[PDB]
Amino acid sequence: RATNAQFDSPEILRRLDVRLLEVSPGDTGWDVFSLDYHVDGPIATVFTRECMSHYLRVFNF
Amino acid sequence: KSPNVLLQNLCCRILGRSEADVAQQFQYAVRVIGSNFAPTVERDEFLVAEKIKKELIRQRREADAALFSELHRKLHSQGVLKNKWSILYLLLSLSEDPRRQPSKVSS
Amino acid sequence: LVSGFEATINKFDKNFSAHLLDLLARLSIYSGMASVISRLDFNGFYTERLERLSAER
Amino acid sequence: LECSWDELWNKVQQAQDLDHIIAAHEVFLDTIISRCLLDSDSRALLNQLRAVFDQIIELQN
């Protein structure tokens, strides 16, 4: 809301959700932070689960 | 060994001290272990295997994530340890993120 | 009196505060529907006392 | 992020069938993963990258 991304349609705003990874004690928060961006429905067949996981690794780095 | 004196031997391993130079550490170890002596929860060894693989993927290593799949395999395949869940829970508690410690095979 | 007046207010305040913090804790485990907690505590004074209480083993 | 996107855009917008979108998305992924440092041969550069990522915060202190 603070930045100018509140013009967006609710669908793309809805698909994103923050995803935790598991923590080992004394690990920094930068390693445990990845967005999920799930997609459900028929579009999940078009963009599969494996694609999303490789994108999450890209997101980490 | 009886479990109480085997608790004293562990305190001889960690510190340099002997079993007669100190007995307060063995007293404290019996104090901690002996109030909940049995496993206070049930085993969830599958879940934490799915968490240690998530540890090796988080540091972006995939050859070690498939090596750990065999390291978790051999423990179940041999079964000389009564609770395979307790040693992995222990190693999970005593681990802090090494930021990719290293890997090797040693032959 | 100050003990048929003030001590009764204090005892009621103790029990109400204890059950209020119990309510906030047992509502905090619940959950987008956590907005009731965030509305109820807007600025606050003594409605948060300890984040988690737990005993070992 | 721009050539892969342009290539992906052209191969998805032309499509007459859904497999032509899917087979383009996988190539978009498979050129990100190789132009970045997350392959098994670019792994050594990722290992060397830790030294850079260490000395930058070392310099702050």
Next chain:
Amino acid sequence: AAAAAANLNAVRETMDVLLEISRILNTGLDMETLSICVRLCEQGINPEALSSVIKELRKATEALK
């Protein structure tokens, strides 16, 4: 016998598998203390208490710091 020396080998194998897990997870334990933790864990133990014992025992030689 033969099956009792096959078991003496089959303990030696597990002790090295857990040793590999110990170094890739970077636990403070090495081979000697792991050989004590396995025998405790054989009889059945709460590891929730075991981890507290070891986080204290490693901190008691930091009192000679």
